[PDB]
Amino acid sequence: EATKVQRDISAFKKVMQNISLAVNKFNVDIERYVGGDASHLLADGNVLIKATLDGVQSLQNEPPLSSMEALALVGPVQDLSNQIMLAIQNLIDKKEPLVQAGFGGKVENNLRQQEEAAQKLSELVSTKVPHELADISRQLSDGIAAGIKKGIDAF
C-alpha cells in the first residue's frame, strides 16, 4: 500500500544513545587510568551492563523492523535521500491531475524554492563535513539536486 506516517523508532535510537554514552564514559576513564583504585572503572562497567539490559527491556514491545525502518536506524542520511527521491517521482507522477487542478505553475514555483533551499543547506553541510568525506557528501547532495531539477523540468 501507499507510504504511511513514519514509524516512531525513537526507542531504538534511545537505547543506542544510552549504550553509546556509557561506552564513552568508560573510554574516557580507562584511557586516563594509570593505576591504583579502579572502583570507578567497575562502576562504569556496571552502568554499561545496566544500559544493555535496559535495552532488552526497552525494546521488548517493539514490532520487527521493515527494510525501510531498519535503514532509517542504520543509515539515516541514506534513508532521507531515498525518501526525497521518492517524493520527486511521486510528484512527477501526479503532473496531469495537478495541471487539471490549476496547480502546475505553483508546483514549479515551489520546486524552484526547494531547489534554492536545498542548495543553501548543501553548501553549509559541505563546510561541516571532514575533508575525506567531501566527495561522498557532495555526491549525495548533487543526486538530490539533480532530482529536484527533474521535478522542475516536468512542470
Contact set with ligand PLM (CB under 6 A): 84, 87-88, 91, 107, 110-111, 114, 118, 121-122, 125, 141, 144, 148
Using a 10 angstrom Cβ sphere, with 0-12 exposed, 13-18 middle and 19 or more buried, the burial of residue 7 is: middle
Say if CB 155 and CB 104 are below 8 A apart. yes
**Alpha helices by DSSP H, 94-133:** 95-100, 104-128
Say if CB 6 and CB 28 are below 8 A apart. no
Nearest approach in angstroms of CB 111 to ligand PLM is 6
Nearest approach in angstroms of CB 98 to ligand PLM is 9
**Alpha helices by DSSP H, the chain:** 10-32, 39-58, 67-74, 76-93, 95-100, 104-128, 134-154
> Per the annotation, does 137 bind a ligand?
no
Which is nearer to ligand PLM, 62 or 142 (by Cβ)? 142
Whole-angstrom Cα distance, residue 6 to residue 69?
9
Nearest approach in angstroms of CB 117 to ligand PLM is 7
Which is nearer to ligand PLM, 15 or 148 (by Cβ)? 148
Which is nearer to ligand PLM, 31 or 96 (by Cβ)? 96
Which is nearer to ligand PLM, 51 or 148 (by Cβ)? 148
Known binding residues: 122
Known binding residues for hexadecanoate: 122
